[PDB]
Design a protein around this nucleic acid. Structure first.
Lengths: 52, 187, 93, 134, 51
RNA sequence: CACGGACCAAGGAGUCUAACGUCUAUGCGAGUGUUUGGGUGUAAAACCCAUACGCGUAAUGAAAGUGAACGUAGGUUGGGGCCUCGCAAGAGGUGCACAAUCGACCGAUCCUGAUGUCUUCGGAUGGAUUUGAGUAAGAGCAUAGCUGUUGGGACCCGAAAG
RNA sequence: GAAAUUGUUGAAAGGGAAGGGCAUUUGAUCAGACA
RNA sequence: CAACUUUGGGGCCGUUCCUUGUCUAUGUUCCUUGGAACAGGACGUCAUAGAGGGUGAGAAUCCCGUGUGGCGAGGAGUGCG
């Protein structure tokens, strides 16, 4: 009641709780989605073999 | 940029910082409480009248004025000397040239007279709780100048042209009357 | 030009409200039903003075739905757009 | 030339991390454009009025594109009829979001856009009007 | 829906009563905003000093 | 050259403030700003709030004043992205910001002088240049930070004083 | 109970400066590690 | 010319204010160290009192206090019961 919700407005006049700018906090779950994993190119590889 | 800085006039001798703002607020609340104790059943304030603000900028607003006029008090059914002792503010220098404001104030005084108990002077007074504020009890109400929705009464004449004819007749009244006087003396 | 002795900013107060922002003046809850009804009887009444404006201006386009617009002043083209929408301007006394 | 934003916002850093991955490993220029746009300072991310979104969606063949605004989407009471579409934005004002939903649309974040449109397919990046001062 | 929060009695046992999580607990957790607002608000009880 | 330096301790010089800016972060966003004040309080904190007011959303003219849509809010050129075909190369379409030019709109300037009219009032209609941080689907308000200017003792000490 | 400055003790250097850089002699001193 | 309505002064006791006085929880239990326990450990108690100060080193529980309530004393007062 004090801070409002998506159902009750608020006791603070004209207050709405802040809105997220990113839907989920976990970015690794986003990157490992089926759609991201489809879109991207093959992985590459992190530590490089020294040539010459 | 062009910017003025008035800080050469030995200003350091007169810098006032309001470190007392919280202390002054507490002292003010204490004073209100103790005055309410002193006047124990009476409210803290006096019944203020309903007033239309002065200028073109503010005449659209209605404001709590200083005190009810003598006409308002007599039309409410009481004398100004008695009104001042039942917490009603009386202003001797305010004039009445507006029936709406006059009737609004008389209605305020009628409501005020009925919403209060006045204890008998002799003694054995009835118990009454102190209501601290009379402006919160009888708030100033903005008159409604029109209903929410109406019919479209189109006269046909333009509004802008009405304003321009008004400005024109304001402009040329004097010379028009001068010409009228000349034609009059020429019969 | 001139030099204006003893300026009082009370009598030269005159805020401007263009036509595009006019319908904001109607409360947001009743606005959509006023748009949907669109009737010459029970057309909405806008007192701009009570809202705090002095002159109505003709910038935007207003929906072709009548509205009774009360103001101290209106521009010629603001008059034309209000009337052409089925509404009217009533000068506020 | 520019790799990290000056904002300390945790979630903005997460968005930058996400689109850094996408712009590294997708070769679609949309993700590169968006990542470049995420680092912009606030004067260089002007708000995009919701009526500007409607005007962009009124173009030829652009009626069903998912608009992306890398910045703030703002209300505009100067518009009365608003089309139902999907809008991806960094931030929505309450009025803008309320208007987009009232028309039947949807206000999605940029990572929800990344899930739906990972290579930025069928999108329409709008940049707000820029000139603020000299 | 909103996950329930169990309510403990004065002896620490969890009663059957449980409550929906209020919507403020889904608010964004912004350490930077908390930091700057704290570091400004934490100055508001100070008293003046001077020579 | 000239000036400072026998030695050691401690002190010792770009500070604070106000008004404007630039940039950046943050909040909200055609709005914004609780903290003059009121309510409340675990009491200079924190929490909450009505009316007003400031700035912004409208400009222009010496002023009276007047006041921003012919059009899909504009035509062409360019333009990040996206869309269509294409293994690709490219081909087309759409084109945000922005930029160039040509038009439109508002005010100012010079004309023309309709519908009518207290016969002098009104300004309809249509042109001519220039013109403005002007409109042409708003971008601001507030706070903070690094800071620039200016005024205060103003980086510190010291000049001939009235 | 600092430094300037001083006394005594021990070591050392000194043919009209003292100090400082690189390197090493010499004397004095001193840390670390278990297939 | 015409009818109605209103009213002082004190004394006594309380209340209010002020200024004062007094009263109002709980370990100085065991072990080690130390010149000193106010330190470390063990077991407790009070808490509307864990603000502060003293006491032979960091003490809620040793002392004064603090917190909360009670009882008074002298006044001012006509504010009012």
């Amino acid at each position: 009641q004090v801070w409002g919700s998506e159902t009750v407005a608020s006791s603070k006049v004209g207050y709405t709780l802040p809105s997220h700018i990113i839907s989920t906090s976990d970015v690794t779950r986003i990157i490992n989605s089926s759609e991201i994993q489809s879109a991207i190119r093959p992985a590459g590889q992190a530590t490089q073999k020294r040539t010459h | 940029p062009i910017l003025k800085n008035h800080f050469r006039k030995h200003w350091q001798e007169r810098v006032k910082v309001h470190f007392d703002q919280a202390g002054k607020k507490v002292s003010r609340r204490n004073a209100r409480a103790t005055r309410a104790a002193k006047i124990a059943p009476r409210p803290l304030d006096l019944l203020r009248p309903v007033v239309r603000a002065p200028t073109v900028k503010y005449n659209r607003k209605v404001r709590a004025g200083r005190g009810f006029t003598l006409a308002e008090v007599k039309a409410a059914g009481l004398t100004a000397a008695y009104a001042r002792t039942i917490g009603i503010a009386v202003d001797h220098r305010r004039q009445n040239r507006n029936q709406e404001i006059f009737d609004a104030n008389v209605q305020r005084l009628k409501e005020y007279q009925s919403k209060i108990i006045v204890f008998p002077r002799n003694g054995k007074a009835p118990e009454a709780e102190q209501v601290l504020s009379a402006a919160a009890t009888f708030p100033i109400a903005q008159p409604a100048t029109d209903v929410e929705a109406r019919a479209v009464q189109d006269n046909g004449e333009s509004a802008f042209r009405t304003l321009r004819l008004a400005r024109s007749e304001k402009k040329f009244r004097g010379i028009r009357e001068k010409r009228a006087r000349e034609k009059a003396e020429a019969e | 030009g001139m030099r204006y002795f003893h300026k009082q900013q009370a009598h030269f107060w005159k805020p401007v409200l263009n036509l595009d922002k006019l319908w904001t003046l109607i409360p947001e809850d009743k606005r959509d039903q006023y748009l949907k009804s669109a009737s010459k009887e029970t057309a909405p009444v806008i007192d701009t003075l009570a809202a705090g404006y002095g002159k109505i201006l003709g910038k935007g386009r207003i929906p072709n739905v009548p509205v009774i617009v009360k103001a101290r002043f209106v521009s010629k083209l603001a008059e034309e757009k209000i009337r052409a929408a089925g509404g009217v301007v009533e000068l506020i006394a | 030339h520019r790799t990290a934003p000056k904002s300390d916002n945790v979630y903005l850093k997460l968005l930058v991390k996400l689109y850094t991955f996408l712009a590294r490993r997708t070769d679609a220029p949309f993700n590169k454009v968006v990542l470049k746009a995420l680092f912009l300072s606030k004067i260089n991310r002007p708000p995009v009025s919701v009526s500007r979104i409607a005007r962009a969606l009124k173009q030829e063949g652009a009626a069903n594109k998912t608009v992306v605004v890398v910045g703030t989407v703002t209300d505009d009471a100067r518009i009365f009829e608003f089309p139902k579409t999907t809008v991806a934005a960094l931030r929505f004002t309450a009025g803008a979001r309320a208007k987009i939903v009232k028309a039947g649309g949807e206000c999605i974040t940029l990572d929800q856009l990344a899930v739906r449109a990972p290579k930025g397919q069928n999108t329409l990046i709008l940049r707000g009007p820029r000139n603020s001062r000299e | 829906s909103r996950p329930q929060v169990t309510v403990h009695s004065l002896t620490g046992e969890a009663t059957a009563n449980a409550l929906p999580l209020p919507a403020v607990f889904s608010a964004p957790i912004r350490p930077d905003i908390v930091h700057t607002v704290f570091t400004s608000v934490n100055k508001n009880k100070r008293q003046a000093y001077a020579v």
